[PDB]
Symmetry: D4
Subunit: 121 residues, 8 copies
């Protein structure tokens, strides 16, 4: 089963980070969310009720990305992966990629980040 | 067998969507189609008749992407995957990725979508 | 005097547009704001008080771009140009470029928009 | 008067060109249209009737770009500039930039083209 | 063994294609070549003689991409995969992706192509 | 008279440069050529003989960019501007922008270059 | 005289800014430098001594962009414009564009900045 | 276990290369580093001490990419993979992709490079 529903390059301005200054000023966090979901019934029926509604997923991600400031991107992706799995039984697994394109790192790079894959139990 | 024939970033202006307004105004749907096909005979012969003609595939995709408006992207990719497999025996499998780069979703993202992989029976 | 302070590609999700559906669903409006301001005193002094603070300008633009939905982009740029000139005497002139990259227009383009230049009186 | 209404990167697949093969196969023509129009009344009124409707302009461009195949891009831009000026009195001047990003030219470039500016009489 | 040596987005202007007009005018063919090669000895030694020289590979690809015009991209990738495997014993496998970003296909897409993976015997 | 014929982002691999190593290894030189030419007769007639043929211009640029290695980009643009003006009476003026995106300069930048504008006498 | 020597998109990680946190963490500052210089003698002679050496200019910019942290971008561009004019008599005028693509501004934009043009006296 | 910590498109100006001229002039080396690390404890705890600190990783990469000039990119990636594994027990495996976007190769391509994956023992 290789079907997926995705949300690419979602961007939020938040205040997460392990450095004090980071939390004060803030920055843009890029988010990629890919969900493993069987889409053949929805492909057959065309009924939005036989699949997972991405608008709702974006809201879940947004509320976490734009909410209380935490330390790690690991903590943000885990809160997201655990929030999507809990609310949707159709999501057999959730992958969250979070990117800090502009962290307090003296250098020239395209970005730094983490990525987790969490199956739904 | 890892050979593939692909059509990348095909773009169509259509009226699909589960929201009334969506169907009225319309939007651009991005499409990525990758077909699993053995290309060694065509690689040996150079005869366009020993492989799958992509122009014809683009027509198949286009006619569905620019035809009657449906609800789900799941329904569009399923109609496409099922239309390419049916007409081409050389396509051992069909993967369809459909992206809504500008859905009625209040936010900043690069796009939302679904992706299905359907083997040919 | 060719000095300028600029804000490029600001993006807001708003509900402006002359079509009903437009106001319902909404879309992303891209904004470019360039202000004619003499920057030599600020260049000499280094005091943020001898120049125009762009953060404040972004707020002005944001509040208009993300506020009550109007019809024309012409009305949005005029409200912005008139709001920046009124509040800042240092701005000898204000240019506002507003782009609708994804309007309800059946076609393939990079975007449509308007641009106004309004001197401060 | 520096106000403008623009349509950027419009793209059409057409069969224009001075070479036989060109007209047979065809290619993508990129089009940039910028109109000099006073937008202060529309900025004050917010009435779409005090400005020029870009949707209609896109249609004018499209119908020429996707119609009978001609030789020169000079002929296409002249037909467009002359068609927008004729139908709109508010357009004090029309600039048409047409780009052939992939002409039958053995080389590596981003594109070739022409650009004309035609005032409305 | 997941080590690889790659050549990305190589571009050549050639006259391949199954349509007469195609061979007359020509077009740009994009090429991606990834070779499976054990790079630990070269990583340990730093001697260019313990790895595969990419300059030579580019020459091999170039000479085929810019040589006699064939029909299929399948034939070009097969000639390339077979030419790199034959000349280099260190290449355990060769993957060739060929893209026609601007084929004689009436539409809007990013490109069409094929991709083959050929192990070295 | 604001009409223009352009050739954008032409790219050539050459050995120009004031440093010995530069001439040995070589690099990619980006070239932008914009010609001031009255295009109304060509716009009226559609005859390729009432305008300037860009294919020929690309050849002129290419032959200089890919020929004998010189020192300055100033010398390359001057040879180009002087070669286009001499051969074409319709070109009222020639602008040549040459960019070295990857010069032997220890740093992070998008590119360095020169640009000249030479009227035809 | 429209000749110019340019340095585009130079990027430096520095600690400038009017906010304490800004100076602590730091960020990437993008710089565009365009110099008005007569390039015909250099175009005729090909001698690097009849024009302005951009490598040296990059060093001047770098040393200021990567040196002591100041408040305004206005102060950085003024120090740069004044440092290039002073050291080079051939530079009839200097334009400095400085961009903060990621300032401490809660929002979605491509960047904010200033631009100054300073003639050489 | 599919969790990963990544550093994308890091860029350094170095003097590596097998050609004399290469080491003299130098060039920009692009680096992609992806580390296999279990991030669930860090996702649960939010303590930066239960995961791998990317800033430190960037320093490790930087010091090698900007240090003594070697011959092969294979030698640079091996030094990096071996330096990250040695210092971090949490990194179950290290993948290093090094790209030479502008090597002394007469042609038009996006880049050439190598990629290694080294598990931590
Ligand atoms: N792995 C990881 N995840 C995060 O979310 C942060 Br913030 C850091 C980190 C902490 C301090 C300095 C640099 C990076 N490291
Ligand atoms: N999964 C899925 N596939 C589609 O094609 C649509 Br439209 C939606 C959807 C429906 C309503 C609101 C938001 C998204 N969701
Ligand atoms: N000039 C202009 N400015 C705007 O803001 C809009 Br919305 C429209 C318009 C109105 C109806 C259809 C198409 C475009 N036209
Ligand atoms: N100026 C100009 N405008 C056009 O539209 C074409 Br097609 C050509 C042309 C004709 C023949 C060969 C190359 C270019 N030249
Ligand atoms: N599979 C495949 N490989 C190629 O190289 C070509 Br050309 C075509 C093809 C042939 C005719 C029309 C459209 C595509 N099809
Ligand atoms: N102005 C200018 N034009 C060129 O073409 C070169 Br090469 C250089 C130059 C010479 C030496 C070092 C750095 C730049 N400078
Ligand atoms: N004009 C200008 N130039 C700068 O260099 C800075 Br920093 C600011 C500024 C200061 C405080 C808040 C927001 C912007 N404003
Ligand atoms: N495989 C490999 N790795 C490197 O790091 C270099 Br430099 C070269 C190489 C050597 C000489 C000419 C062309 C490429 N080849």
């Amino acid at each position: 089963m290789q079907d997926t529903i995705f949300l690419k390059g979602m961007r939020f301005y938040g205040y997460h980070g392990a450095l004090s200054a980071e939390n004060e000023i803030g920055q843009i966090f890029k988010v990629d969310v890919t969900l493993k979901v069987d889409l053949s019934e929805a492909g057959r029926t065309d009924n939005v009720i036989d699949t997972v509604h991405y608008g709702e997923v974006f809201e879940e991600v947004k509320s976490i990305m734009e909410g209380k400031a935490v330390n790690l991107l690991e903590h943000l992706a885990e809160r997201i992966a655990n929030r999507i799995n809990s609310q949707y039984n159709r999501v057999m697994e959730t992958k969250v990629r979070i990117t800090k394109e502009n962290p307090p790192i003296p250098g020239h790079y395209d970005g730094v980040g983490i990525e987790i894959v969490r199956e739904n139990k």
